[PDB]
Amino acid sequence: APFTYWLNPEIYDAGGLSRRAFPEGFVFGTAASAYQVEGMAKQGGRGPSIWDAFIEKPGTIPNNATADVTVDEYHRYKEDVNIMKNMGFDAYRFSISWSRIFPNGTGMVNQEGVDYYNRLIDYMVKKGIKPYANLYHYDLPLALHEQYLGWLSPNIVEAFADYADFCFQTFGDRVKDWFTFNEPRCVAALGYDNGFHAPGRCSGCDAGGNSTTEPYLAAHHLILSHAAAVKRYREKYQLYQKGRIGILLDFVWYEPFSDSNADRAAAQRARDFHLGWFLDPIIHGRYPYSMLEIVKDRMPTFSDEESRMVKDSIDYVGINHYTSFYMKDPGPWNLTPTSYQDDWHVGFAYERNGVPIGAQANSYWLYIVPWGINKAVTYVKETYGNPTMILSENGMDQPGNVSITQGVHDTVRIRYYRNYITELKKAIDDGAKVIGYFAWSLLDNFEWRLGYTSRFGIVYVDYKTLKRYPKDSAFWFKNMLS
Numbered sequence: 001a002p003f004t005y006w007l008n009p010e011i012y013d014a015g016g017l018s019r020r021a022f023p024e025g026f027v028f029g030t031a032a033s034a035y036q037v038e039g040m041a042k043q044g045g046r047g048p049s050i051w052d053a054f055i056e057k058p059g060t061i062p063n064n065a066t067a068d069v070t071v072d073e074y075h076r077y078k079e080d081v082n083i084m085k086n087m088g089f090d091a092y093r094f095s096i097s098w099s100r101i102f103p104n105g106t107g108m109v110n111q112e113g114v115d116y117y118n119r120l121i122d123y124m125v126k127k128g129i130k131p132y133a134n135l136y137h138y139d140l141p142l143a144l145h146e147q148y149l150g151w152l153s154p155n156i157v158e159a160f161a162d163y164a165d166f167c168f169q170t171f172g173d174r175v176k177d178w179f180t181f182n183e184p185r186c187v188a189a190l191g192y193d194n195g196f197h198a199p200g201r202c203s204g205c206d207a208g209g210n211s212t213t214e215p216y217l218a219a220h221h222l223i224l225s226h227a228a229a230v231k232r233y234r235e236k237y238q239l240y241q242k243g244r245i246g247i248l249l250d251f252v253w254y255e256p257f258s259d260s261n262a263d264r265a266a267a268q269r270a271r272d273f274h275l276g277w278f279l280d281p282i283i284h285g286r287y288p289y290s291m292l293e294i295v296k297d298r299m300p301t302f303s304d305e306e307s308r309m310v311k312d313s314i315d316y317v318g319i320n321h322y323t324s325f326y327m328k329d330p331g332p333w334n335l336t337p338t339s340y341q342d343d344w345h346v347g348f349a350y351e352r353n354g355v356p357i358g359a360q361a362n363s364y365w366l367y368i369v370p371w372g373i374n375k376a377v378t379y380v381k382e383t384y385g386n387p388t389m390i391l392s393e394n395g396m397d398q399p400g401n402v403s404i405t406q407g408v409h410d411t412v413r414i415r416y417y418r419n420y421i422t423e424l425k426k427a428i429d430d431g432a433k434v435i436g437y438f439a440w441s442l443l444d445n446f447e448w449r450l451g452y453t454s455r456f457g458i459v460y461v462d463y464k465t466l467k468r469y470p471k472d473s474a475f476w477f478k479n480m481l482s
């Protein structure tokens with residue numbers, strides 16, 4: 001419809017933002033993941049992942065949609081990179097599909113898979129887009145899950161390190177910025193606490209599991225796998241390739257509902273279980289105190305050697321930040337362990353004095369709370385010794401069921417980005433060592449359990465034709481970044 005092409009004046013209101021408002025060399029980019037954008041899930045030599053198996057169960061994804069094709073970046077990568085360049089972005093964080101490189105997780109390399117990533121990276125470099133390569137975004141090769149239950153076995157650690165090592169050796173001559181994992185908290189909690197994500201394990205889940213122990217086991221092995229991969233990079237590659245390696249951690253801002261000691265403690269406890277679970281080991285070589293005291297024997301311990309390997313195993317930390325909630329003390333605690341989520345012993349709140357903390361996006365979990373990004377970045381600065389940070393994801397979603405015509409006029413997303421980036425700038429002006437910002441995501445894509453019912457892109461994708469239509473938010477970035 002002709003209204004698709006109405007010029008939204010919001011595009012040109014940058015709210016005082018520009019590159020001059022950020023540090024010299026500050027990177028702006030977009031982020032996506034292999035499974036969510038590539039397609040060719042069962043082609044090109046790619047081995048099955050745990051999500052290929054998980055999606056097979058009817059009812060798992062709305063309308064039984066799959067990511068077998070999704071937005072087909074496998075074939076359309078030049079177009080996508082061209083849009084990124086045209087909108088003024090400096091960088092693209094993509095992920096490498098483990099099972100596209102090693103169909104069964106180990107051993108035989110799938111050369112067709114290697115050739116794909118080589119094409120993608122060479123084109124990015126040609127067009128002057130900086131590659132940031134994440135090694136893992138939820139896509140464990142099914143064979144490793146079948147062999148020894150994947151993240152639940154110590155066997156996975158060296159399996160991951162070998163895969164990482166291969167990637168460094170193969171792609172590290174042009175990829176200078178690496179991440180080991182996207183959101184290991186999500187991998188552990190959604191995969192093994194409530195089974196919402198693959199492999200769908202939890203207490204009483206059809207696939208089996210134990211919510212009291214398995215999340216902590218998976219998280220422990222993810223931390224070890226991260227540190228073993230970083231060891232490979234540091235000992236064999238870093239000096240020659242002159243790149244950097246880190247990890248991507250989700251961080252919801254938890255704000256005390258009131259200034260009571262109990263509510264402040266509740267908020268800290270939520271931070272500990274959400275972020276500290278991974279960041280305390282990396283920065284201090286130990287788990288958070290609250291977690292140790294609450295979870296006790298159900299949390300694995302690091303050997304002295306492991307602790308040394310894990311501590312300072314990053315050159316920077318990616319903070320994936322979207323939203324904030326209020327946190328309350330929930331009263332006396334139940335003494336019987338039931339789940340990781342229950343181990344937090346906190347109460348969530350979404351409003352205070354009849355006022356919502358913010359408007360909701362399409363996603364049930366996503367509340368629009370711009371001030372939260374400032375508090376979250378300041379918290380990491382003050383708590384973890386002013387580490388080098390990348391704000392590695394930020395964005396919001398519309399319903400999937402919107403047309404091209406209305407889908408492109410995403411004024412709410414412009415406001416989201418203007419406000420959140422403004423609040424991030426305040427944190428940086430106050431001393432936070434943030435070196436980059438990445439929007440989730442360039443394209444509308446396969447949104448895990450929500451399938452195609454959620455649209456996170458700054459570029460609309462018609463799923464019938466796979467044609468791209470930049471939304472007003474993409475043009476907002478284009479104007480702001482120029």
Ligand SMILES: OC[C@@H]1[C@@H](O)[C@H](O)[C@H](O)c2nccn21
Pocket residue numbers: 036182183250320322393440446447448456
């Ligand atoms: O929900 C939108 C996106 C996901 O598509 C993706 O897994 C990303 O890593 C992420 N972290 C928090 C939210 N999101």
